[PDB]
Symmetry: D2
Subunit: 249 residues, 4 copies
Amino acid sequence: EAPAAVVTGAAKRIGRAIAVKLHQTGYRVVIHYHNSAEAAVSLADELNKERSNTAVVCQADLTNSNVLPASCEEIINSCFRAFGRCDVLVNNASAFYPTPLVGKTVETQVAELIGTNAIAPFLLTMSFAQRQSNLSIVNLCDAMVDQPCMAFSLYNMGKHALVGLTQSAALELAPYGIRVNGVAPGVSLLPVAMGEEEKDKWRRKVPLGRREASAEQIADAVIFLVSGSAQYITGSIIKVDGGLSLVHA
Amino acid sequence: EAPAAVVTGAAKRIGRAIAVKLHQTGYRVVIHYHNSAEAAVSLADELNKERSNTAVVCQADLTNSNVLPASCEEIINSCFRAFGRCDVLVNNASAFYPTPLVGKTVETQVAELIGTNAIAPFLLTMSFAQRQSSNLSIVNLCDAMVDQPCMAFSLYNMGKHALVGLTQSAALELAPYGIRVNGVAPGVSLLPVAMGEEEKDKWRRKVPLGRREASAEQIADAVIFLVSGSAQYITGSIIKVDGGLSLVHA
Amino acid sequence: EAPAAVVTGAAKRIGRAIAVKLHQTGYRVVIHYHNSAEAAVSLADELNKERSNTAVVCQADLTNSNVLPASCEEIINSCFRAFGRCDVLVNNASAFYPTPLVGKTVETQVAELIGTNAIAPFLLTMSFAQRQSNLSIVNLCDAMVDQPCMAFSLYNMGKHALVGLTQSAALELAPYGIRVNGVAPGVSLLPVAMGEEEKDKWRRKVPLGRREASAEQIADAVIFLVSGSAQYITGSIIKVDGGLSLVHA
Amino acid sequence: EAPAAVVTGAAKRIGRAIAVKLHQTGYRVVIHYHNSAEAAVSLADELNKERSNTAVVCQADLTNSNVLPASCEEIINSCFRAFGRCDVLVNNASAFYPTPLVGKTVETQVAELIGTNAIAPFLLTMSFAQRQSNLSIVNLCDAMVDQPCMAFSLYNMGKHALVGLTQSAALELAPYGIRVNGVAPGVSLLPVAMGEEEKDKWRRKVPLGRREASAEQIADAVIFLVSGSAQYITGSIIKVDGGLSLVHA
Ligand SMILES: NC(=O)c1ccc[n+]([C@@H]2O[C@H](COP(=O)([O-])OP(=O)(O)OC[C@H]3O[C@@H](n4cnc5c(N)ncnc54)[C@H](OP(=O)(O)O)[C@@H]3O)[C@@H](O)[C@H]2O)c1
Ligand SMILES: NC(=O)c1ccc[n+]([C@@H]2O[C@H](COP(=O)([O-])OP(=O)(O)OC[C@H]3O[C@@H](n4cnc5c(N)ncnc54)[C@H](OP(=O)(O)O)[C@@H]3O)[C@@H](O)[C@H]2O)c1
Ligand SMILES: NC(=O)c1ccc[n+]([C@@H]2O[C@H](COP(=O)([O-])OP(=O)(O)OC[C@H]3O[C@@H](n4cnc5c(N)ncnc54)[C@H](OP(=O)(O)O)[C@@H]3O)[C@@H](O)[C@H]2O)c1
Ligand SMILES: NC(=O)c1ccc[n+]([C@@H]2O[C@H](COP(=O)([O-])OP(=O)(O)OC[C@H]3O[C@@H](n4cnc5c(N)ncnc54)[C@H](OP(=O)(O)O)[C@@H]3O)[C@@H](O)[C@H]2O)c1
Ligand SMILES: CN(C)c1nc(N)nc2[nH]c(-c3ccccc3)c(-c3ccccc3)c12
Ligand SMILES: CN(C)c1nc(N)nc2[nH]c(-c3ccccc3)c(-c3ccccc3)c12
Ligand SMILES: CN(C)c1nc(N)nc2[nH]c(-c3ccccc3)c(-c3ccccc3)c12
Ligand SMILES: CN(C)c1nc(N)nc2[nH]c(-c3ccccc3)c(-c3ccccc3)c12
């Protein structure tokens, strides 16, 4: 029987590439999404056309609130309901925008940035562990977490907290055979929202090829960590950044 | 005119040691507290006996909620109200208890552990900056053992990791405003009030430098250094005060 | 045409396992050794018996000296002489013994521990780059480098230097398309000879399975890093440590 | 009576500021130097004029060689000869120049850069410990050690090794009551001869004040670490960098 994975924020960009690559490796997948319903459904259709009954969708807002724990339990339950098992969890969903220290209320900014990047991953990890082979969790971290973008305090706080969870959960879940690791992009998939000077600016900074990573290149590191070639790896965060984090100001 | 400082969770233990040391150094202090009203007012009294109108208490819950930003703005406002200025913010208040992955609800555990150790610091830092020859700084109480977490303390550890991020992010963003943001990271310092002595000494024997926990004063000494003119170029630095504990393998 | 790899300290233990796995993967290999002449020649014999003309040995002392640069240049030259190309360098060879602060002279301890663990990797890197495809270098680091063993200051200084080399070379060699990464064991392959009681003491410290890594598990991470699935990864150090580095005192 | 301190490389710039500030705090000092004999002699004169026979000079090359251990033992011996005690060691002396991976020979660059930045500090640390209250060692590290300057591998390796020494020696010397810490400048006291327009290119990068640290600001962290206000501080590296290491590419 085929193992099953949950991928959060899987309708597009990097999460989509991760879902596709896991599916290509033999996994049945739960495609979690928030607003991108059309793309999520379209992906499930593509994957199921490829192998019957190997993809479902699960919608949820991963903003922090009093109902988040239940939402996270529901996402995990989705995988068990469809597939009878949940082997892999990939915490990819993430809000990202500036929150200057000096439009949304600040409390809403806290809820979204800290929720998606950290609390939800924790609650998902909890539900995943409680519901239990090669079991593992992969968290999408930031290679430049110690050289933060100006004015992105809350995002960066969420991403540091995710490092904490990766390490703490690796330690605590190791007794149950559940590995917990991170994959930490530098820049990958520059937005269409972004100008040509701005994109070029980022690309010129990347030592290895002066270009951003493709989504597939991020997904390759996820595949490695969930594989049997990573059986002794837990609590490790693998940068997939082309050397970007090594470049001083 | 004397500068003024806000210390969170300053009614007892390390926070009090910090408020006391700042006060001795010439600061006027806002003693924030949550449940320890008697301890806070008593400290405020001691300090005002030393110098009149140099201490005030300020009560606030720093659990995450949708009014936390208001609460944090009020704390800073209380320093301006009392003293006409606010030079130093120390983020010391902290909830600490296990939250196993496998009867406070989890919502409450998330709110208290992430609110006190990270979100309140952020919102206080926001309010401190917004409300502004001077020496403005923020000191965050971090964990020296943040990368070797205690078993079953994931939310507390997430909170402290987030506080590293805030220290770095805020150092970067507030530097152009003349506001320095640093950390002090104890290893083991004042042991929990309810801990016994088979266990207190088990923590003590782990510490390379002296086989003993740090005194509150020793933690405060590092805080006083970072707020001082002797640290005028230091920002985004987290100073470990751990007797080498973080260097010891399993 | 088959790519080629130099593995230092490859006659036994972890370097041998890395050489065996690269070879099983399709590489021709230079098996470098210092003293284990017999284990080394036996390994080339066996690999060549499996695929003709795919392994050679190369003897060099990697202690620091004024001749170390020529010795490192010759190692890389030996790979080109045998195979016509040099695609991969694995800096595995390492002296390891205590050097307390309070039979070998200190001169000799410095030369052996700092030479093998840091200066030879640097010179081999230089010769690798100067002599020049998915080109990459993998350095064998320590997962515990920031929680050092008591009385192992020079060994630890070496392994820290190795971290700096991994990062500096990743940055500098990126424009040439050469990736530089690290694999960081916690405990792996305990000396057959170390006492059993001491062995079980190390084993009981590892969160994931309460056992040391196999040599093959370490090699798996090397294989990942030199592969086409790691083409945007440079300057990354992957712990393969079962969470050991995460455990407080 | 008054404590005593060795400062390596103390004839000018940051080492000189450290020596002066220690002396002003009440220490007697050994002013170590290599080439700068006029400045070292002149400094000791100035300090002895303040307080009689509270300063001596000591010349030594700290390049790695077979005689480096005796050289370092003689530096510590010189403190004992002059003042009968040695309470503080400041490892400040450092060679700094590029060593590209692609007329000094490379073995000489290894010897100078690894010798001054790491091996001499180790040797001085050994001698200091052997010859033994508030005893401590302060090592001059880099805030930018994980974002290395392009083509400065050997220097960066040296500074990484020095982090490792700081930590290893803190652990090992703690039972002797000797604390071991570091001070990590970002950019400080730029060379007088560097054009001001090149100086401004570094300055512009520093978040706190768009300027470099004074030598005195660096010395202030050293004075803190050696003081009774840092009596529980060991194995800590304090960045004094105006936020520079936080700024991304
Ligand atoms: N791209 C990079 O260069 C880069 C760099 C560093 C780190 N990362 C990390 O790598 C991961 C993938 O990056 P990305 O650029 O692909 O991410 P992204 O496109 O910014 O976001 C991925 C998905 O997150 C989901 N999401 C956002 N807010 C949400 C909410 N409130 N509740 C539930 N889901 C929500 C969205 O779902 P819907 O679209 O369905 O609304 C979105 O598709 C992220 O964790 C990111 O932080 C990426
Ligand atoms: N002690 C150590 O060994 C150690 C180790 C590592 C890190 N640290 C860090 O150093 C700091 C001081 O340590 P400590 O042991 O002195 O701290 P503590 O005694 O555990 O807590 C300090 C104060 O935090 C306040 N607090 C707790 N929950 C709160 C809430 N919901 N809202 C507002 N305030 C709240 C309490 O105020 P009231 O009493 O008024 O309710 C308490 O007095 C903490 O940040 C801690 O994490 C300490
Ligand atoms: N085993 C672990 O738990 C562990 C933990 C952390 C890091 N690592 C790292 O992983 C790598 C492999 O570990 P290992 O246990 O397999 O190493 P090892 O058995 O201690 O050393 C491997 C080889 O190093 C070579 N070597 C030693 N001194 C040399 C010299 N002066 N010149 C040239 N070569 C020399 C030896 O070659 P000859 O036999 O031919 O003389 C030896 O076979 C090392 O870099 C090590 O530091 C291992
Ligand atoms: N300046 C910065 O921005 C910066 C940044 C990062 C780290 N640091 C560190 O802070 C410390 C002080 O920096 P700096 O800029 O003041 O250093 P520096 O001027 O480049 O060098 C300091 C002294 O090192 C001595 N030295 C050089 N080679 C030597 C050798 N082979 N043997 C013995 N002594 C030798 C020299 O002595 P003589 O003059 O007597 O020959 C020199 O005066 C250094 O360890 C440095 O790496 C500084
Ligand atoms: C949709 N995008 C742009 C992202 N989405 C999410 N959820 N997280 C992101 N993190 C980054 C980022 C963060 C720090 C340093 C570099 C890239 C990014 C980012 C920022 C710039 C260019 C490309 C990616 C990012
Ligand atoms: C009241 N106490 C005990 C604390 N309070 C707060 N708010 N934070 C704390 N953090 C720790 C701690 C964390 C990691 C490693 C060691 C101690 C502790 C801690 C835990 C055990 C022994 C001493 C201190 C701690
Ligand atoms: C042959 N051995 C014993 C080694 N050889 C080399 N070249 N390097 C080694 N590094 C380690 C090590 C170092 C720090 C923490 C754990 C293992 C070790 C090590 C030390 C103890 C048990 C297992 C491995 C080691
Ligand atoms: C005399 N100088 C220039 C130095 N001397 C020594 N012994 N070490 C030095 N380290 C640096 C440095 C290294 C990395 C990043 C920034 C500055 C420097 C440095 C490099 C550039 C500008 C100012 C200082 C430096």
